Amino acid sequence: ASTISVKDENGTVKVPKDAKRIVVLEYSFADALAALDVKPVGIADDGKKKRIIKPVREKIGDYTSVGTRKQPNLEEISKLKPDLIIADSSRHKGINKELNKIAPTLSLKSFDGDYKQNINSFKTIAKALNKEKEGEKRLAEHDKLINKYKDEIKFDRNQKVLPAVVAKAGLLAHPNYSYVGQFLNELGFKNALSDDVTKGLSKYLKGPYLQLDTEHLADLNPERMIIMTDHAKKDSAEFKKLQEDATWKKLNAVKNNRVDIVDRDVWARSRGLISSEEMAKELVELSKKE
Numbered sequence: 013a014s015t016i017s018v019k020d021e022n023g024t025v026k027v028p029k030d031a032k033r034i035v036v037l038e039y040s041f042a043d044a045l046a047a048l049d050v051k052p053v054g055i056a057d058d059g060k061k062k063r064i065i066k067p068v069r070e071k072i073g074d075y076t077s078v079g080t081r082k083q084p085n086l087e088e089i090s091k092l093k094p095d096l097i098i099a100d101s102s103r104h105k106g107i108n109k110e111l112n113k114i115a116p117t118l119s120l121k122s123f124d125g126d127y128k129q130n131i132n133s134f135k136t137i138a139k140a141l142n143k144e145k146e147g148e149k150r151l152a153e154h155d156k157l158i159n160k161y162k163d164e165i166k167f168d169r170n171q172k173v174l175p176a177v178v179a180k181a182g183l184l185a186h187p188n189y190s191y192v193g194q195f196l197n198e199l200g201f202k203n204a205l206s207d208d209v210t211k212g213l214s215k216y217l218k219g220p221y222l223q224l225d226t227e228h229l230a231d232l233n234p235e236r237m238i239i240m241t242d243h244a245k246k247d248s249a250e251f252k253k254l255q256e257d258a259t260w261k262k263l264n265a266v267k268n269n270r271v272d273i274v275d276r277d278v279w280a281r282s283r284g285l286i287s288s289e290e291m292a293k294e295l296v297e298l299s300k301k302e
């Protein structure tokens with residue numbers, strides 16, 4: 013058993029050179045494998061096939077679900093007898109000992125990674141699979157496409173942007189150091205949540221995100237909002253109440269048609285090469301509307 017030594021979030025892992033059958037426990041890792049022409053044998057897909065973004069899903073084809081990302085089914089992982097498991101370094105600390113009894117296990121950032129950290133996880137996966145050159149090629153293509161979309165996005169970058177999900181009668185905002193915040197910065201946007209602004213709102217943190225009620229949204233008054241919702245729907249009971257709010261109606265972004273509702277699976281959950289390309293393409297399209 014010859015191996016390739018790579019670094020992951022727990023130290024060194026010796027990955028077998030004959031690793032071909034791989035179980036992945038986050039969506040971004042499925043994207044990584046598809047980009048490298050590898051079809052995972054198992055995916056933690058939350059029992060929801062549509063959570064795997066379409067071009068990735070269609071390239072991989074048939075696979076076995078191993079359950080939720082929160083609580084993967086280790087009997088189903090065992091039964092697959094994989095060569096390698098790719099686990100999330102935040103979600104899967106508790107199951108790590110059990111996963112290592114089944115197969116060599118890489119522990120990589122996805123859930124608590126920003127945009128650059130997710131691309132770093134892609135690089136580690138490529139190296140682990142003896143596909144370093146293929147990964148370099150793919151990332152050069154990705155970067156060229158992202159910068160082409162950047163130049164086609166017509167929006168005025170002086171209009172500061174707030175990315176968020178809907179929660180608890182307000183918005184649960186993704187700050188400038190989140191995956192989405194950092195990606196928007198890569199596209200030349202200015203996040204409304206500057207470091208100074210976020211410092212002055214920190215009593216409202218809920219883990220990685222900032223809970224903004226309408227009073228605090230009114231004070232921030234970002235010129236643009238991107239609101240990520242399941243299925244890109246805007247008619248949830250929660251989001252409808254938020255809008256009957258007198259303060260919401262006076263917001264600059266609302267008065268001027270600069271609130272866009274986008275798909276949460278693509279924008280928040282996927283964290284892949286294909287999904288980030290799709291986010292950028294969507295911004296081009298929105299910017300070219302009448």
Ligand SMILES: [Cl-]
Pocket residue numbers: 123280281
């Ligand atoms: Cl997620």
